[PDB]
Ligand binder design. Structure first.
Ligand SMILES: [Ca+2]
Ligand SMILES: [Ca+2]
Ligand SMILES: [Ca+2]
Ligand SMILES: [Mg+2]
Length: 287
């Protein structure tokens, strides 16, 4: 077990096209996957639109779609295939109703969204009724994903977190001493490597991204690299045509999935219950 974890320590970008990954996924023997979506409704979204979204809030409802609406739309166009039943569990976190402690379900009895159509539909209905708040932690959304996976009896899931990457940090700490939010988020990423769960951070807005890269590349304590960072605004910024960016997004999202899936098998997680994952209950959507 010691040697198999240092085999899956860090996962580089080992694929230059979507086709290479699609093939690597076949060769890996991936037959069934499900998506979970988490959306950052923290107040940082108010100022992380400075350069990338014209001094507006990333959650601003205008005449054209905001980076959250864009990401939901492009995830639906590129990854909807990887949810086998097209029912998407969708959760908000970091509004006044949840802060850094909970998540809320997009629909009432934690009814899953009917495709990315309803994820987008509901995002629009929900965000104007929210108070963007904080602090910012991924612990609750990762716990929610862990609970979904555990209750499924270890079915492979991909948690897609759309976020501005601004997790609460000690602005003056000189060494690498961690905020409570960082610490709990890291503990959650570590806990989640006991389960057949892949995480993909779809970054929107200006960054900075130092911490999302830390989560991507450098968490020694975890059983396998279960975290990919995708700079979605860097990709959409580029000069090339729309469909050529959609492809680059898809490649970047799926980049770590082949080795991650293999890890769930080699580490004896796929189709197993861990047994000791405390059940998390999502709050209802704000009304
Ligand atoms: Ca599903
Ligand atoms: Ca990684
Ligand atoms: Ca990576
Ligand atoms: Mg925040």
């Amino acid at each position: 077990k010691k040697r198999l974890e240092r085999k899956y320590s860090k996962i580089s970008d080992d694929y230059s096209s979507l086709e290479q990954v699609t093939e690597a996924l076949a060769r890996a023997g991936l037959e069934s996957s499900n998506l979970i979506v988490g959306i950052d409704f923290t107040k940082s979204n108010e100022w992380t639109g400075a350069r990338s979204f014209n001094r507006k809030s990333l959650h601003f409802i205008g005449s054209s779609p905001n980076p959250y609406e864009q990401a939901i739309t492009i995830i639906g166009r590129t990854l909807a295939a990887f949810d086998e039943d097209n029912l998407i569990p969708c959760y908000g976190f970091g509004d006044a109703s949840t802060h850094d402690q909970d998540v809320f379900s997009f629909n009432s009895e934690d009814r899953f969204c009917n495709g990315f159509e309803e994820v987008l539909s509901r995002y629009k209905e929900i965000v104007p009724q929210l108070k963007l708040a904080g602090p910012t932690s991924f612990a609750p959304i990762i716990d929610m994903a862990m609970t979904i996976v555990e209750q499924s009896g270890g079915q492979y899931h991909v948690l897609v977190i759309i976020a501005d990457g601004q997790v609460t940090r000690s602005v003056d700490t000189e060494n690498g001493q961690l905020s409570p939010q960082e610490q709990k988020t890291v503990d959650a990423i570590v806990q989640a490597s006991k389960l057949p769960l892949s995480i993909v951070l779809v970054g929107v807005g200006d960054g900075p991204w130092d911490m999302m890269r830390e989560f991507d590349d450098n968490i020694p304590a975890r059983a396998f690299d279960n975290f990919q960072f995708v700079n979605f605004t860097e990709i959409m910024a580029k000069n090339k045509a729309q469909s050529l960016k959609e492809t680059e997004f898809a490649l970047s999202a799926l980049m770590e999935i082949p080795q991650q899936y293999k890890a769930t098998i080699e580490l004896n997680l796929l189709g197993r219950r861990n047994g000791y994952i405390p059940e998390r209950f999502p709050l209802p959507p704000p009304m």
